[PDB]
Amino acid sequence: QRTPKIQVYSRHPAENGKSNFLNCYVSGFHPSDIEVDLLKNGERIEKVEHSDLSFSKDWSFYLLYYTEFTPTEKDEYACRVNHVTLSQPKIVKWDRDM
Amino acid sequence: LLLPLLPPLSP
Amino acid sequence: GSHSMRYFFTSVSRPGRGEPRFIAVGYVDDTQFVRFDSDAASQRMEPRAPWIEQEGPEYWDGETRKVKAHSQTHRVDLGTLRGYYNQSEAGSHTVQRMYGCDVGSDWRFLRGYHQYAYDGKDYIALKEDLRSWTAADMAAQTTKHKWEAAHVAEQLRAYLEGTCVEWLRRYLENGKETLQRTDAPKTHMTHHAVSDHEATLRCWALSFYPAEITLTWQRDGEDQTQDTELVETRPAGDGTFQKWAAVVVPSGQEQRYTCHVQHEGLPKPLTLRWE
């Protein structure tokens, strides 16, 4: 019944060549079944972990999906989400300034 | 520490 | 300040095969410290903060036994609720439960609570007096009646005012180096031209704990609420939180605008200004 909200961001301010963590924070959704992938240059990243499912006072769920990565000038990243409330995957490109 | 017992809606 | 211990439970039925997926997480304030996931291999309550590993094997055995008992209660409740709402066996449904207790700054019981939801909607909740129930709908009137007759609130209140706060105080002490440390936000402003005549000022709050924070923009010392883009507070992934607030301003007028940061780790709010 409720669509996921997405924020895609780095744990630390991004500097090319310095290891970091790429985060996709998905929240406000219901029910809990959800598919979240992190993409590098359009391709799914394999070693992605997530937080343990919890929820907010309106009962909507939130999860953090995350992976280690070393940003570079040319590489692009994104977060891809599928949920029953979405007709096809929602994809948000990572912007180092947000 | 969890609640020792969690009653169901209806036993 | 006050502190809370809270447990969050989600169980989701699996109509095609098998029993519900059950996930339990425990928090002290904004710190997760235990979890149980019925899909994991261990079938144990597991630690997620270093200070809970100070507890010996008796704790993990006892919490595993109780958390499995909690899972079975949620499983049977999904069956009860399917009946109360006249729903078929073919659909997947969800129960969510949150209960916990707070201590005040005086380290005494402050409040306790126990809320329950079905399919993402309020179902029943314990009232502030810890002696009565609020039902959201007519199905929950049945539960209110049955839990009244079975004096469910009385055992719950005994835990909330007793064991719950005793173990919260235990955890706060054992984990004091983190649980009772405030991490004030590390704050900075960035400037991004969007044209020759306009720029975005973004006010950043990073690495803070707990998660409660207020970020606001002012122009000439009065609020600039309407024009602010404010993202929801988000986890860094290392146990701290992040937030930012941005405004678009005419180039050359940046000095009129101030960012104001309120956080319990700050003795006084911070004020940031682009020179």
From TrEMBL, chain C:
Disulfide bonds join 101-164, 203-259. GO terms for cellular component: cell surface; early endosome membrane; ER to Golgi transport vesicle membrane; Golgi membrane; lumenal side of endoplasmic reticulum membrane; MHC class I protein complex; phagocytic vesicle membrane; recycling endosome membrane. Residues 185-271 form the Ig-like domain. It is a single-pass membrane protein; Single-pass type I membrane protein. GO terms for biological process: antigen processing and presentation of peptide antigen via MHC class I; immune response. The keyword Nucleotidyltransferase does not apply. GO terms for molecular function: metal ion binding. Its main location: membrane. It is found in: Cell membrane; Membrane. The keyword Membrane applies. Zn(2+) binds at residues 151, 154. It comes from the Eukaryota. Keywords: Disulfide bond, Glycoprotein, Immunity, Membrane, Metal-binding, MHC I, Phosphoprotein, Signal, Transmembrane, Transmembrane helix, Zinc. Belongs to the MHC class I family. This is MHC class I antigen. The chain holds residues 1 to 275 of 341 of the full protein.
